[PDB]
């Protein structure tokens, strides 16, 4: 086509989606990770995770307001990944890399899994 | 912080949100523009438009499944802008620039209004 493109549009959209998350505006699901609860937008979760994409395209699960993750999932690892989904920034540290990678594999977040594997390979 | 960032994340999120729109997945509102109807995600509309941000943060309007725009609004201008919201690409043409700018002013989409004003100034 003959379209023009606004370079910062996608980033500005995500920044606004994160502002809505911070103020709990139009969040439509609670993700339960053991004793912790995380409110989010189903569409954003689906856009970032192969697991959430599969869950919310399911004709029955699409209508659930609460999703319980596998008990092996670490709440901090999930929190770091939820922040990444809404910001593009990943808080990857020596103390959390194993939990973050395990959570990203479960959530089917391929690019996060890739950088975790590379950071781990560098320290061996 | 000591975060790393995935450059393409925001773009990939928006691409996935547009795929959901194309398959009518988790769309939660219909925007009526005269005889035309456009299905969309309230969160995406709010993230792109000052008008939709104000509408869906309203305690009563936040629960509406149908929003009727002002009858002066052109359905093609709205369609071009809805596509821009979900893709960052604006199909700006000599034949549609006036309708697109009028719609972007109504929707409170400042960057679109700015490029329309510049393209119009160049042709005078």
């Amino acid at each position: 086509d003959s379209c023009i493109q606004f370079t910062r549009h996608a980033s500005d959209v995500l920044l606004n989606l994160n502002r809505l998350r911070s103020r709990d505006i139009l969040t439509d699901v609670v993700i339960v990770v053991s004793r912790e609860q995380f409110r989010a937008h189903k569409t954003v979760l689906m856009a970032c995770s192969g697991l959430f994409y599969s869950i919310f395209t399911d004709q029955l699960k699409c209508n659930l307001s609460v999703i319980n993750l596998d008990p092996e999932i670490n709440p901090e690892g999930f929190c770091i990944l939820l922040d990444f989904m809404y910001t593009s920034r990943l808080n990857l540290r020596e103390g959390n890399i194993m939990a973050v990678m395990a959570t990203a594999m479960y959530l089917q977040m391929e690019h996060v899994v890739d950088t975790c594997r590379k950071f781990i390979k560098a320290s061996e | 912080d000591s975060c790393i960032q995935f450059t393409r994340h925001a773009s990939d999120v928006l691409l996935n949100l547009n795929r959901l729109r194309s398959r009518d997945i988790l769309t939660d509102v219909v925007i009526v523009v005269s005889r035309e109807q456009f299905r969309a995600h309230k969160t995406v509309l709010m993230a792109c438009s000052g008008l939709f941000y104000s509408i869906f943060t309203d305690q009563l309007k936040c629960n509406l499944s149908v929003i009727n725009l002002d009858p002066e609004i052109n359905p093609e201008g709205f369609c071009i802008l809805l596509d821009f919201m979900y893709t960052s690409r604006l199909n700006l043409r000599e034949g549609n620039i006036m309708a697109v700018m009028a719609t972007a002013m109504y929707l409170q989409m400042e960057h679109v209004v700015d490029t329309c004003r510049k393209f119009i100034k160049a042709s005078e």
Binding site: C3, I4, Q5, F6, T7 | R89, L90, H111, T115
Partner: peptide, 4 residues
């Protein structure tokens, strides 16, 4: 704005 750019030419994509």
């Amino acid at each position: 704005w750019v030419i994509p």
